[PDB]
Amino acid sequence: TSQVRQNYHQDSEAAINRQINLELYASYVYLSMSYYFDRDDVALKNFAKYFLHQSHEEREHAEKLMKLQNQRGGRIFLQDIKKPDCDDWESGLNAMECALHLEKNVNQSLLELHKLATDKNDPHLCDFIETHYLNEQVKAIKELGDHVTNLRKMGAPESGLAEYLFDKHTLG
Amino acid sequence: TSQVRQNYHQDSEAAINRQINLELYASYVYLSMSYYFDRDDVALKNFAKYFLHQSHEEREHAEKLMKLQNQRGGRIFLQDIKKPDCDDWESGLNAMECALHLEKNVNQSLLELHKLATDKNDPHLCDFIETHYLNEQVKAIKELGDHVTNLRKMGAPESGLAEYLFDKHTLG
Amino acid sequence: TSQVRQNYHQDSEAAINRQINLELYASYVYLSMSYYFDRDDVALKNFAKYFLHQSHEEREHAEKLMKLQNQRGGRIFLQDIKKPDCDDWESGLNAMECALHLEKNVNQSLLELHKLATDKNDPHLCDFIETHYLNEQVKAIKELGDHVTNLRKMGAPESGLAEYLFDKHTLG
Amino acid sequence: TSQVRQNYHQDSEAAINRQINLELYASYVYLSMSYYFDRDDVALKNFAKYFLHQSHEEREHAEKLMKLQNQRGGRIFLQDIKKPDCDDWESGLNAMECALHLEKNVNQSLLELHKLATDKNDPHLCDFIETHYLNEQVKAIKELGDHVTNLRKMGAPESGLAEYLFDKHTLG
Numbered sequence A, B, C, D: 001t002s003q004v005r006q007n008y009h010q011d012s013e014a015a016i017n018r019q020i021n022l023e024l025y026a027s028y029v030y031l032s033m034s035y036y037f038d039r040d041d042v043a044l045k046n047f048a049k050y051f052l053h054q055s056h057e058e059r060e061h062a063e064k065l066m067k068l069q070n071q072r073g074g075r076i077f078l079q080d081i082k083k084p085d086c087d088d089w090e091s092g093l094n095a096m097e098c099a100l101h102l103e104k105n106v107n108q109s110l111l112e113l114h115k116l117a118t119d120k121n122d123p124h125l126c127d128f129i130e131t132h133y134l135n136e137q138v139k140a141i142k143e144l145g146d147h148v149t150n151l152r153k154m155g156a157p158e159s160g161l162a163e164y165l166f167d168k169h170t171l172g
């Protein structure tokens, strides 16, 4: 047993390892989306920049969970990072809709994690999730919702002009 | 009787209290409009910013009238601030049209106030209204008229692209 | 249904709308108190400044709740802002006592809101209330208690000298 | 006839000369009050400073009216500046009450002047009075009312401590 471990349930330790994998997966999804918009037949550079930034932020999320695992005396257990569901993302609107779906899935996982930490009476872990993850997810979901709304109202995905101008004015 | 009161008719005092309520009501209308554009299914952030600024300016209008009431030795008398007429505002164009209607109503009230102050031979109150309120209203009405015109000519409310681009270029 | 809504109970949405109204009401109470101390027959300018600042902070509280409602995909629903219970506030001590009563009422409402968010297993909303509201209320109640104590010990409300000197030394 | 004179009634010219005398009289009253508080058996230096500043501001009021008389092509006509009604002012409270009475008398004269300018359809003179005099009088009367209120509530004129502390905190 770790000399630092205190009030840290084995189930919570396992759930944190699963969350680490999911954050790394989200980083990979955003990396894929980013370079889709870097293709010469898509060519929306601020979509590409926006999703690359999101990819780096997910890697930071994963690193913070790994730090937490060690802080609490759990042991990190890594699994394969699955490739994203799509190779081709269709349009800026469809990529934003996929990102919204991804972030709501990550939020569900975090809420299940919080439920477990509550059930195991682990207030440090509850506070860690609330401080570093839950409002970040709410802000990310709201931003992506805003983006989807604007792209739809502007006429995407049929209007390539709409995605071009959104790239310049909102993401630029 | 107030030791400072001089040439200040009871009718003028009452009219100033009514105007205080109307300025607070206009602040509330603009607050409601602002957060309509903050909804995830509307998502026009500079419309939201513009109307929040207008809301704060109406609260300043109300505060200046309360200051005036005390300066002249009248006594402030507050009433409920009614909720705005709408919960949902439809479109950026419709909100601008509502704001134009609101500002012309506030201007009519101020012109009736000035008529009363003229009838009661109160030149200090006439000058207060002319200095701090009447040209402010004329400028606000002209600005909102300009905004309505541009949104109509651009194709709003049917063109969501129009409202998006107006948000960026005129309100941004 | 809102595309962003996740784990946000209809009861919580309604409770947030009620809290928005209560924050706007508290802003109005403090606005009324402020201009009471601006009267020529009261004339305590730092009492007036103190309560005007408190009024603006309550409007910020309300705005943050409106932002939260939209962040979570709820829909804002406004009601009339009732006029405060008093027109005349009697003395600096009595106004401070009224403010203490108001802030403890607002705190009770926030604690009921937190109880509901706990019952609906909404950790994001619990954390929002704890981060932005609960300690703010505890600090405000403690400050107002301190102020009431000092005014009583100095001899208020009978000693107009006491309220004058408190205006200069504590609020100045 | 003056080569510049236009729309300037002989009655208005005479009324402006009377107002010049009244402004010079108010300057003299405040000069007398100032040096009352400089006496070794009164010895309130910030009362003395406050009334000396008021005296200089009244001389500026008079100079501006003399400038106006020449601007409009009227001819200045001076009369004796009467000595103030009192040699001894009793107390800081009594001097403030006298100043309040003086400023309300000056305001009545200005309102009669404005009534005359209105009757003679002289909008330049109306605007001059409203811009440079009427709100200045309202602010001065409100300030003096505030001061009287505070001195009374603190226990003046019986409390020499009250006048001492008002001298330091409000006028200092």
Ligand SMILES: [Ca+2]
Pocket (backbone or CB within 6 Å): A082, A083
């Ligand atoms: Ca596979």
Ligand SMILES: [Ca+2]
Pocket (backbone or CB within 6 Å): B082, B083, C080
């Ligand atoms: Ca109603």
Ligand SMILES: [Ca+2]
Pocket (backbone or CB within 6 Å): B080, C082, C083
């Ligand atoms: Ca009522």
Ligand SMILES: [Ca+2]
Pocket (backbone or CB within 6 Å): D082, D083
């Ligand atoms: Ca004589």
Ligand SMILES: [Cl-]
Pocket (backbone or CB within 6 Å): A005, A006, A007, A008
């Ligand atoms: Cl343990």
Ligand SMILES: [Cl-]
Pocket (backbone or CB within 6 Å): A005, A006, A007, A008, A009
């Ligand atoms: Cl343990």
Ligand SMILES: [Cl-]
Pocket (backbone or CB within 6 Å): A008, A009, A010, A011
């Ligand atoms: Cl365990």
Ligand SMILES: [Cl-]
Pocket (backbone or CB within 6 Å): A013, A014, A017, A018, A077
């Ligand atoms: Cl594991």
Ligand SMILES: [Cl-]
Pocket (backbone or CB within 6 Å): A017, A018, A019, A021, A022
């Ligand atoms: Cl996983």
Ligand SMILES: [Cl-]
Pocket (backbone or CB within 6 Å): A078, A079, A080
């Ligand atoms: Cl694996």
Ligand SMILES: [Cl-]
Pocket (backbone or CB within 6 Å): A130, A131, A132, A133, A134, A135, A136, A137
């Ligand atoms: Cl967070």
Ligand SMILES: [Cl-]
Pocket (backbone or CB within 6 Å): A138, A139, A142, A143, C071
């Ligand atoms: Cl947000």
Ligand SMILES: [Cl-]
Pocket (backbone or CB within 6 Å): A135, A139
């Ligand atoms: Cl936030």
Ligand SMILES: [Cl-]
Pocket (backbone or CB within 6 Å): A152, A155, A156
């Ligand atoms: Cl469409």
Ligand SMILES: [Cl-]
Pocket (backbone or CB within 6 Å): B005, B006, B007, B008
């Ligand atoms: Cl009168």
Ligand SMILES: [Cl-]
Pocket (backbone or CB within 6 Å): B005, B006, B007, B008, B009
């Ligand atoms: Cl009157």
